[PDB]
Amino acid sequence: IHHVTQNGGLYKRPFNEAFEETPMLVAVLTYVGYGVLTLFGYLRDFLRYWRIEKCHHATEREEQKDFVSLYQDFENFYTRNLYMRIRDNWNRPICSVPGARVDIMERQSHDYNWSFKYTGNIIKGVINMGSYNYLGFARNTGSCQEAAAKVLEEYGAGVCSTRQEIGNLDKHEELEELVARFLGVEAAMAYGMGFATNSMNIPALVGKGCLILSDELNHASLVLGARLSGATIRIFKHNNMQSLEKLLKDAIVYGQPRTRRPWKKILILVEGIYSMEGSIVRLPEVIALKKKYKAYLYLDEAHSIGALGPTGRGVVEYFGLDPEDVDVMMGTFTKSFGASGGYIGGKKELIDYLRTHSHSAVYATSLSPPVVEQIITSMKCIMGQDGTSLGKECVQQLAENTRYFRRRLKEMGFIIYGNEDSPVVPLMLYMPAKIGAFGREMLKRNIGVVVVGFPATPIIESRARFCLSAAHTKEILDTALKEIDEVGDLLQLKYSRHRLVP
Amino acid sequence: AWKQMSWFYYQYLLVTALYMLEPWERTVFNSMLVSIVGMALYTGYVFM
Amino acid sequence: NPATRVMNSRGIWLSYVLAIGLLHIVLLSIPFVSVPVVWTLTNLIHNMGMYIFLHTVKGTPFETPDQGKARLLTHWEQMDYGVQFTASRKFLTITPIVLYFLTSFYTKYDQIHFVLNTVSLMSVLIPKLPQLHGVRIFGINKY
Amino acid sequence: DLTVKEKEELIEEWQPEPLVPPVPKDHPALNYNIVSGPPSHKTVVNGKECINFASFNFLGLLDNPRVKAAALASLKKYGVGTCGPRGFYGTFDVHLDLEDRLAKFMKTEEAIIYSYGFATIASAIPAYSKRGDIVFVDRAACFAIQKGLQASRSDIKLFKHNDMADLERLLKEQEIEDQKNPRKARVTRRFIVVEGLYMNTGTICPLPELVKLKYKYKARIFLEESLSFGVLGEHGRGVTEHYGINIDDIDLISANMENALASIGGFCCGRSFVIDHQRLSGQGYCFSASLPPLLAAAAIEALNIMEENPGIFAVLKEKCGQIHKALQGISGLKVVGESLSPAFHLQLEESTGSREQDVRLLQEIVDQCMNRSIALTQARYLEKEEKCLPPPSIRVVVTVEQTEEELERAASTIKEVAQAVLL
Amino acid sequence: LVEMVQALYEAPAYHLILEGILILWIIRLLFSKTYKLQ
């Protein structure tokens, strides 16, 4: 309707995004601060060899001085010289329900973050922009936290066996039937850990003789599940549909690496939303390529199920596509439902296969009944099933909040990554000493944010990540936008070469 | 005029990543930064 | 591996060409030296630093990517996933050659500075041949 | 090479295999039992009322009314979920409190909790052991240990079950290779991975000799005791207290909070030198949401009861050797396990010769015992994915909530149906 | 720098030969393909 591609991907509405490059002077200035820190790290290592006290940390026993050393000292070099200098903004403990405002325990340090001490005070009312609470279902008073209390009273905290022995209740049977109606598939299956839905079910689908095509920026669970299967792994550029086709065509003409026999099959692992990048997958082009080359698709929508689409169905609904064109769909319940666990949906022969040949079904214990009762209630709320318009209002509110926030920051003058419809907003702040300054200066102003540094991102790509929700009022959101300006002026974070105009 | 002048030292501390070093490390760097420039004018005076 | 893509990042060549240019002004600011000796010191110090950082320190400064498959490889052998004659491996091969044509011209073509600069240039260019990709001369620096 | 016209023919003739294989014939599983209500002492399974001999809660702490009050009081002030991964506003004060209580209970220095019982020992092994290391693993280890070993690309050398002569023969062979290349032997680490009170066999590891071997051949120990924690010892501290061994000799200790604590998750306890490393290196601790606070509030309440009344561990063992003596004598069924183990096996004596015919035979005993109100289960494995697949069996699991009358009536029913199916 | 330029004329034989061999090392290395090792 709107536009097509040479592949044949049909886009109904515009697909517009932006990844502006780092200005040259800022890049040149980042390396100065990354070299000055390294020089001093070497100096401090030398002093700590026989001259500095450094008695605040731990060592090996006296009886095991002649074993081979447990660690390789050069691996935890950045940990003890860089990360440790500004690690007072990464494990902040909270003491209340997390959403839209949280209470943080106040801690202080005297030997430069090597040890901490809780004074006894509490910072109340801190605006929360650090936890995934899309749609705002994380609360301690309402109708979803009302039924969990009933189930807990009669069932108990947790089960004590596996799904295949005696840990198969009727709650599990009641939830797996509802997830399939939500997604629009035939059958589903729920597990109990989002990280273990990938690393314990991918090795049940592929083995030696098969090929895996991974996106550059995949989650750790997706990468571990592939490493455990025994298949060959090949990585393509991020969201590049030319790299994927060039790497997909060259695998059907040349076969396996040494014997040069045809591959048994080919699997493609992508994600719905990339949380550190803020982008959305080009799904209509990935679907129009795996039908032309007969590959299988594996979608991981842990950051979009409930956060995209007119009725909160995810990226498949957001693009107007047919849910049955995807071989496996997997997701979590911990980013939009305020719960725990994960699911896989798809055909009926696939779920039938996985119920018998999955590592989790036979070795790992089942889900907790009070958590299943959370998911069942909030999923019914979203479907408009309860009777109120809470599900519709909360779905729409997040869209306007995202649009307003992302538009204001662009006029203000910052560099923002990603797609215009993405509820994750990464703010660019490149220099290594501004990582430690932004987190410290925002908490002095009652705002909670997360920051990310080098051995998680590229070298000059440090950023701050904002998460929006449907519980953020317009009066909270204005307060946050007003306080971000002051810190952006104070630390000089407005790098954009071409700023927006109202 | 004090506040304004204090702001440039803060920006200098961030651009060079001394905002996150201890006081003694900071003094070790500020000492050899001023000496090199100091002996850079002396060599640009005798040979001029 | 996050450490193989560093030498490709935006502004890394111009930031490196200024690291040698800044060392040549702090060495030439000494009150009691000579111009020929300032240009020999630049060449030797740069080549020794490059030798240590590219051909002696092996492993990463952070947690090894996958169970430590690069715990025995110097930074030169990890670079660009082992692929030879990339732009980043050609810049670092040509730079010590260009910096030799200047320290030959500014020393007036002396005979004793030759036996120093030539020894240093050979020391920095021998390890970069594709034929030595992993060879440890007489066992030294292997574990 | 390969003009652009015949490439389409190659691309066009290719034909992949289906994503899942078509089912060949009738399978064993694919018939989950459907329990209505909670799996408590008296359970309803498949519409019938029966006594539970199949669940792994040895202390009867699941439906303890006191444990649920502490879980509701934590549900009433936190909600149900933690909306993040423990390094981004995901740590609560409940998590730190539970970590301190565990460390104080084990008389250890530090502790770390995971949000999933399987991912505890599957993430801890590959965080210490790397590409060029030797690991000596017992032959009857569980599946989580095998997956953790597979994820750490190290050299696995697996020895017989519970014999120190084979472990010593394996270590002495490694010493001969240390004298052939002394430069490489000084950068190579050696780990011994053992499991107090094995689950696949029902036996108990000999620890005092394994400690002596540690200091003689210089190899660290990794104890994995998720079935002796809160069962063995005179305080429920595991096997180290059973043998009277100093706990500073066992390097790392692991367990899960799912059997005797009747909750969710696992934990590792050790010295601060080794436990501090997993907080930045464990895969399942760094890239997963942390444990729901109402589940961490149940473990603290269970751990309070475990310390208040220490005579509950003597009760569990007194009636553990009761059903292990009331079963000896069945014809066609043999007992595999120790007199001190609350979860042992009944394996089939002299199997026909076809596994599929033994899994089909034991199910007759299970299905016909369950009609006499005695619920049993069968051990499940992933046949094609196991190093040393055990024989088919029937788990018999003892708890403190089973009275002596029920225990002595279970043996009669098991013997009655087994001497009439195996005849 | 009058002295420096007038000294390249009187440069030894074996040196200007080493600077000609080194200029051919660059040209041959500035025209290669790529070839990941097998």
Residues E35, D153: Cα–Cα separation, whole Å: 28
**What is residue A125's three-state secondary structure?**
strand
**8 A C-beta contact, residue C62 and residue C71:** no
Residues whose CB is less than 8 angstroms from the CB of residue D15 and which lie 6 or more positions away in sequence, other chains included = A294
Rounded to 5 degrees, φ, ψ at D282 are -65, 130
Tokens linked to A182:
């939500």
Tokens linked to A309:
């689409």
For residues A66, D237, D289, A174, the Cα torsion angle rounded to the nearest 10 degrees is: 140
Which residues of chain E are within 8 Å of residue C94 when distances are taken between CB atoms?
26, 29-30
Angle at D200 between CA D199 and CA D204, to 5 degrees: 55
Contact status of D56 with chain A (Cβ, < 8 Å): yes
Which residues of chain A are within 8 Å of residue B19 when distances are taken between CB atoms?
433, 436-437
Query: Are chains B and D touching, using the cut-off of 8 Å on CB pairs and a minimum of 3 such pairs?
Result: no
Q: Which has the closest alpha carbon to A75: D280, D237, D46?
A: D280
Tokens linked to A99:
């959403």
Tokens linked to C14:
């111009």
Residues D382, D359: Cα–Cα separation, whole Å: 13
* Rg (alpha carbons) of chain D, rounded to whole number: 24
* Rg (alpha carbons) of chain E, rounded to whole number: 16
DSSP A203: G
Paired with D346 in beta bridges are: D335
Q: DSSP string of A327-362?
A: SEEEEESSSSSSS--EEEEE-HHHHHHHHHH-HHHH
Chain centroid to CA A286:
21
Tokens linked to C114:
């030759």
DSSP A7: S
Tokens linked to C108:
């007036």
Residues A132, D82: Cα–Cα separation, whole Å: 9
**What is residue A172's three-state secondary structure?**
helix
Residues D256, D233: Cα–Cα separation, whole Å: 17
Chain centroid to CA A110:
34
**8 A C-beta contact, residue A156 and residue D57:** no
Q: DSSP string of C90-131?
A: HHHHHHHHHHHHHHHHTTTT-STTHHHHHHHHHHHHGGGSGG
Work out the angle between the directed axes of helices C114-125 and C35-55 (0-180°, nearest 10).
Answer: 20
**What is residue A121's three-state secondary structure?**
strand
CB contact under 8 A, C9 and A74: no
Which amino acid does the sequence have at E10?
E
Tokens linked to C55:
């051909």
**What is residue A157's three-state secondary structure?**
coil
User: How buried is residue B35: exposed, middle or buried, by Cβ count under 10 Å (0-12/13-18/19+)?
Assistant: exposed
Residues D301, D298: Cα–Cα separation, whole Å: 5
Contact status of E28 with chain C (Cβ, < 8 Å): no
Which residues of chain C are within 8 Å of residue E33 when distances are taken between CB atoms?
85
Residues whose CB is less than 8 angstroms from the CB of residue A42 and which lie 6 or more positions away in sequence, other chains included = none
Residues C7, A31: Cα–Cα separation, whole Å: 12
- H-type alpha helices, chain E: 2-8, 13-16, 18-29
Which amino acid does the sequence have at D58?
F
Which residues of chain C are within 8 Å of residue A76 when distances are taken between CB atoms?
63
Three-state DSSP string of chain D: CCCCCCHHHHHHHCCCCCCCCCCCCCCCCCCCCCEECCCCCEEEECCEEEEECCCCCCCCCCCCHHHHHHHHHHHHHHCCCCCCCCCCCCCEHHHHHHHHHHHHHCCCCEEEEECCCCHHHHHHHHHHCCCCCEEEEECCCCHHHHHHHHHCCCEEEEECCCCHHHHHHHHHHHHHCCCCCCCHHHCCCEEEEECCCCCCCCCCCCHHHHHHHHHHHCCEEEEECCCCCCCCCCCCCCHHHHHCCCHHHCEEEEEECCCCCCCCCEEEEECHHHHHHHHCCCHHHHCCCCCCHHHHHHHHHHHHHHHHCCCHHHHHHHCHHHHCCCCCCCCCEEEECCCCCCEEEEEECCCCCCHHHHHHHHHHHHHHHHHHCEECEECCCCCCCCCCCCCCCEEEECCCCCCHHHHHHHHHHHHHHHCCCCC
Residues D152, C91: Cα–Cα separation, whole Å: 37
Tokens linked to A63:
């009886």
Which chains are within 8 Å of C by 3+ CB pairs? A, B, D, E
CATH of domain D65-308: 3.40.640.10
Q: Distances from the Cα of C75 to the Cαs of C5, C59, C126, D367, D396, in angstroms?
A: 11, 7, 15, 64, 57
Every domain of chain B and the residues it spans: 21-48
Nearest CA in chain C to A456: C2
Q: How many CB atoms lie within 10 A of CB E21?
A: 8
CA neighbours closer than 13 Å in the CB half-sphere of residue D147: 24
CB contact under 8 A, A431 and B17: yes
Tokens linked to A260:
């040069």
Annotated catalytic residue A366? no
Tokens linked to D336:
């595999």
Resolution of the solved structure (Å)? 2.9
Q: Distances from the Cα of A460 to the Cαs of A30, A427, C68, D150, E18, in angstroms?
A: 7, 13, 25, 35, 40
Q: Residue A227 is inside which H or E element, if any?
A: helix A220-227
**8 A C-beta contact, residue D51 and residue D277:** no
Domains of chain A in sequence order: 24-58+70-128+392-491 (3.90.1150.10), 144-382 (3.40.640.10)
> Alpha-carbon torsion D273, D274, D279, D280, what sign?
positive
Q: DSSP string of A434-464?
A: HHHHHHHHHHTTTEE-EEE-GGGS-TT--EE
**8 A C-beta contact, residue D154 and residue D130:** yes
Contact status of D210 with chain A (Cβ, < 8 Å): no
Tokens linked to E24:
């051919």
